[model samples]
Target: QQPTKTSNPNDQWTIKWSASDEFNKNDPDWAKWIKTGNLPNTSAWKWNNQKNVKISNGIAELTMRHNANNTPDGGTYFTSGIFKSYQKFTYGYFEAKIQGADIGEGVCPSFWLYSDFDYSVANGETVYSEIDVVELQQFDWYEGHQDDIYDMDLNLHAVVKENGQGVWKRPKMYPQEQLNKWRAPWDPSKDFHIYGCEVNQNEIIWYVDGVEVARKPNKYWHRPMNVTLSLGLRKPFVKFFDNKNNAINPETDAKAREKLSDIPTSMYVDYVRVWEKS
Candidate 1:
């Protein structure tokens, strides 16, 4: 069985609901949530209250739900979880329980771990690796697509070199069939589900509950990894340049914020644990 990792006493893990009132404030441990900025550079990567992202208990919550139409950014159309841990771990198992937000034509909710170093730094000094434990987006064309059914994605990225020249490569990609195999019985948006990752000297493994989902070979470069959770408006594959082509409409923003205020969308994180061979 997988060992427990968290700050809660039960040792099973702790739950932080993004929908809770405590959602946006920085925690005592500095594990608070933040947002990224507007498009063309649409990453939702902000430092504090950037795009109005929040957290409660310990879960990071997005104020806006899915944008039915593209946000002028030409990115995926959705709003979901986004966060990064203040602490870093070299090699251990990391996990979180998440649920998807409301569905639209195109929305993606995801959880992953990335190198602790800043990727924008010079000399590629902070080149780090990444693991995508889960990615849920609505696909209307799905034959048996249930409104709340989720699509899971597991990916491993290795960043070699530095600066913009740094190479971030995905070592593995689970096709739709493979992702479907990991689906939970309950709708992902209705409740929480376990999501996890194990990184060591040789490889990294991702899981949903106790089941192994994906693995990457020798991807660890001795760099510490930080956890990130986000629900975003996916950007166009080409690149967004103008505000008109890449912006969140004010009317839509107002509606989303109002709706979220009444029944906000959240990603509950039970606990985040890390461990290596003793």
Candidate 2:
């Protein structure tokens, strides 16, 4: 039978708050935090006092100070944060509040989850056991110009074995039937909006501010997953900013610095809560 969901008494689960500081450490009830070995600024992800970021209550806020004034192939400017929950969950309700990056061409702020295991290995890797829940890479200008206000998309992924190798991939299983086609009430950058997911052995459902946006059905959806919140600049900004270091013209150098100083960006989380079946 499908598990019942209600705020009435005698519910099998209860609500628990995950504080902002907890992001610095591995969720105590589950696995420890292991830095992703991914390259570029890999070692610099520790929770630190970034000039434009702040964490209070259960939320985290990042405001753009300025662009890095990077040049053709040199410096890249941005401030971001990485955080996760304290416990690993198999079946539960995961939710949080998020606001998009203010205005700019390359701001991408997101809320997502990653696997606890290395599913990229060729063998001994579990298939259909990984989960990626995200509302990513929202390019506002791209959306506005395309006239696709609903351009906001949710991505769900799982590990699928192929050619005897464990390959992590997205199954494209969102249930378009129950989707709510409405823009967020407030500008995403101006206020926090809810981003949530409900996962069980039978299905995975995503909600934006209490409205169901997408749902995927499958038994393999049940697995231990952790939460992640991050703010960042996309590759376009990086490429544009990185190319200026090769400049020889004094005028070019001055213009590059001015360009870097204006890219506005940030991400903030008001709170995170996880509720599981008891």
Candidate 3:
């Protein structure tokens, strides 16, 4: 059954708004956010490509494949995904239940929020923000690359003022104290788990399966942002390599092309929901 909003009166945190997508039927309302053209700055694949994004049997799938045609570019990789939110929020709770792709090496599946930048001509300034609720870099999931995947990363970023100029703040992770508090019992790639973030004026807190994992003060995040969910490959941005320690080899690109035919993977999203304070 589809989930519905419930009442919460503590701290006057009534549900100011809520949206849920179950992918039970065709043309779900969230489809409006699907990209119709090529994803900006990505050479891998086009967004919403028919063969890559599919919704059936109450599941939404984003597939990633290798491109042999070399149509989009001379590049060999083609990934399928969509990200962008119709509604924007400032301070709220964002959540998604997702089953990530287990494809080893190069693939990254993530759920995050991005703030748009506004340039102030008079002051010569630009500002933006980003909060990664969960990102599974499959290559780094296992210990010593044994394929026994376990954890995910939660990160925060922003543009801050330094020396009277706006600069990008390095992404920060939740402290070890918080990260050690909630470790997944099983491989995240094999099961659906609830991942979320609660953002308010004072701080941003991360949650796994409804339990709090970490929290950080809101030192720079103050703008409204949109949600993004994507499955991508890291070929163009980073050279293809067979191993982490090994140097990037030209032959790895050829091997990647061959691997694409044998290993087509997909990410399944059961639902996504957002709640704003009253």
Candidate 4:
């Protein structure tokens, strides 16, 4: 069901006009977004190139396709789209009506927020924050099935200063608050659904189609962050980028290679919106 303004759970919030995109136009508004020709500087993966984003029929389409750099196993490198907002918000509701990419297990379509800069604390850990509203099929499902397709990974990651270095904290079934993944009753790849997150001084709340799914106290996510949408290649497919080498794992390469038909899968976004308290 399409939501009206009443869909927001918070009564006091108002839409942040400049930060939202309706995608009704045929092309993205470059003023509000940066079409990242490459993945974020924070990402470890290579193989990301540009020009995979477009708008059609009032929908934002982000696709991943073969780069034609085929591996011997029949798998190949891929290129996809990434958009990062110039506007950063601190305390607000962030959401999107997103349809997952139908391209099988090789790629991930995601909506999330990340700190714009790393702030150093005097004699303390430097901080960088990220809150994932929904990361669809970024990894294998916990039960070890190929059904990662049905999972919505809602997790927060932080690079906290650790012994003079910043280290990433990464997921969850729970004692309740620590649960990170939710299995949707329907496949996200099949339809559009709303996924949202509310962050304030007190807590972070996650919602699926206007229903609350999880909540946790605000511990470290306090910085103004950029909104981002990206289609990325994940495990069992591409390798993590590093100084020594940049490539995909040969074993999983074969696995992802066997599924060559999935090369051109895409994620469609109906709209993106944000709100802040008045």
Candidate 5:
């Protein structure tokens, strides 16, 4: 169930969407956007509506499972869950209160906005944009630093026209010295925290628990984008699975598999809210 919207002077901004505190898959708001079938690009899992998504006790859970016998072309794993907002927005304050998955080794939990565009023969190029509010990969720790999994990544990406060709401008991570300042104080898998981005015509600002962490001046992100929430399995993190040159020791891989399969892990969401300037 979701909290009802109420009027407030400071809250004069328009709300794009807000999750109810109660879970209802059949709710008209999310029924059309809950993902199903095999998701493209990722090789780890088939998105199953019946098994992956569940709403109960005022929380929405996105579960990822390890299928020992399910060997896809890329890895021997399966995962669940994704939700795309039916509505779209150009710019605003987007936020979510989330708790990461406990295992954290192979999972990637994200809240982002994306939109696609085509090549304009008359105008001369293609355009695409994406704003990543927050993406946390539990296994992407600093080299030799295994305990830094609580790091959060904020990014801006776009493909724009540059002299008749497409040019991609993508920047990742906050500055290194400020990285620790943005890192979660506690294990993110154990509790909920607010993650947000304020996007406008001039710049995009990132925040954690109401504190500003990073910001980027607006450049190529001028179009509307769909809001997305997903739990993904990164093939590179799936040990023993050979992808390029990244492969873990067989003993370490085996240990990871055993630990991952021991329990069904999930990404829990308390709510998602969006607001636009009045």
Candidate 6:
């Protein structure tokens, strides 16, 4: 059996129509997804200004390209894509059919749930969180590791604001146990695979091609968050521990940069589906 949310009828899962997309249209349906405006860039890369997000032939391609017009690695200016849903979801099953990007060690293609706000007061304190369903490439966490093409970074994070700057604290305030990683035993960029997460009040379960891979307790992720799909560049391609981002070691950055060919890469998404318990 495929063990999908739809494959099991008795699971009582109903699709969240507003939060799902088959990408049949030529352009991103602005009403369902917010691709630009009010979006911010990361310390490492910027969202593409034009044409990086495209939909056609039943697939959506989120691309990343090396632009010489911009400088030094993500180099200077690699336009990529990061799209978020207009509707924020609390809990259910979130999934996507994706072919990960394989251009180089720095390309990070991901699907995640993210939110940062004061949801409620618990003990007079607020809580925020992000659930990374899957972060690919950037073979992080080890020295001398290759593409990390077979590795999937599936993690839960706690968000907080420090000195007026919002940041995720994990390995920050929570234990390292909140961070999770798995290897699929195959290169994700080679073929399309179903990456999914089932979140409830009790726990969060992860799946790849219908096979259970990992799970974490629902300790602090009860709040609603935006569902997102992104193609970015960082970490395994540059300095993993460079908090300053400008402090990258030349040799390491050069080594990461030399691996790229002239060809641009993409994260191809077939569809994204969100479901709630019926």
For each candidate, what TM-score against the reference? 0.58, 0.64, 0.76, 0.83, 0.76, 0.83
Q: Which residue pairs clash within candidate 5?
A: 1-20, 1-21, 1-22, 1-23, 2-20, 2-21, 21-58
Q: Residue 277 in model 2: shift from native, Å?
A: 1.8
Of the two candidates 5 and 6, the one with more favorable TM-score, higher being better, is: 6
Off by more than 4 A, model 4: 1-10, 37-39, 42-50, 71-76, 117-119, 123-126, 139-147, 172-179, 239-246, 249-252
Please give, for residues 33-136, the per-residue lDDT of candidate 1 as tens digits: 33333211244321233443555666655544444444533333344435655445566666666666663323346676666445665664436666666766
Clashes of each: 24, 11, 0, 0, 7, 3
Ranking by lDDT: 6, 4, 5, 3, 2, 1
Model 2 CA deviation exceeding 4 Å by range: 1-11, 17-53, 56-59, 63-79, 120-137, 140-150, 171-186, 238-259
Cα-based lDDT for every prediction: 0.49, 0.50, 0.62, 0.71, 0.63, 0.73
Over 69-185, each residue of candidate 3 has an lDDT whose tens digit, in order, gives 444433434556765665677788788888878664556677888776654322323376788888774444223433234656777765655556666655424343222223477
Query: Model 4: per-residue lDDT, tens digit, 1-278?
Result: 12232334446777876668889998688778875542375332333324678889899888876655453322335566776788888788888989987765767788999884464653345388788888887655455554467777888876667676765555433324434677889988889999888888888888888878788877668878888887777765655544212346433566766666666778899889988877
Model number with the top lDDT = 6
TM-score for candidate 4: 0.83
For residues 1-278, could you state the per-residue lDDT of candidate 2 as single tens digits?
12223323364765544422323322222233223332123221222224555656555665544433422222333444555554566777677667666553444566666555445555534454544444544443332353122345555655655677665543333334222223444556666677777777777777777667677664445556666666655433433223121223222455434445445456776655667667
lDDT (0-100) at residue 13 of candidate 2?
63
- Ten-residue region with minimum lDDT total, candidate 6: 242-251
The weakest ten consecutive residues by lDDT in model 5 span 1-10
| Better-scoring candidate (lDDT), 2 or 4 | 4
Best by the TM-score measure: 4
Candidate number that wins on lDDT, 1 or 5? 5
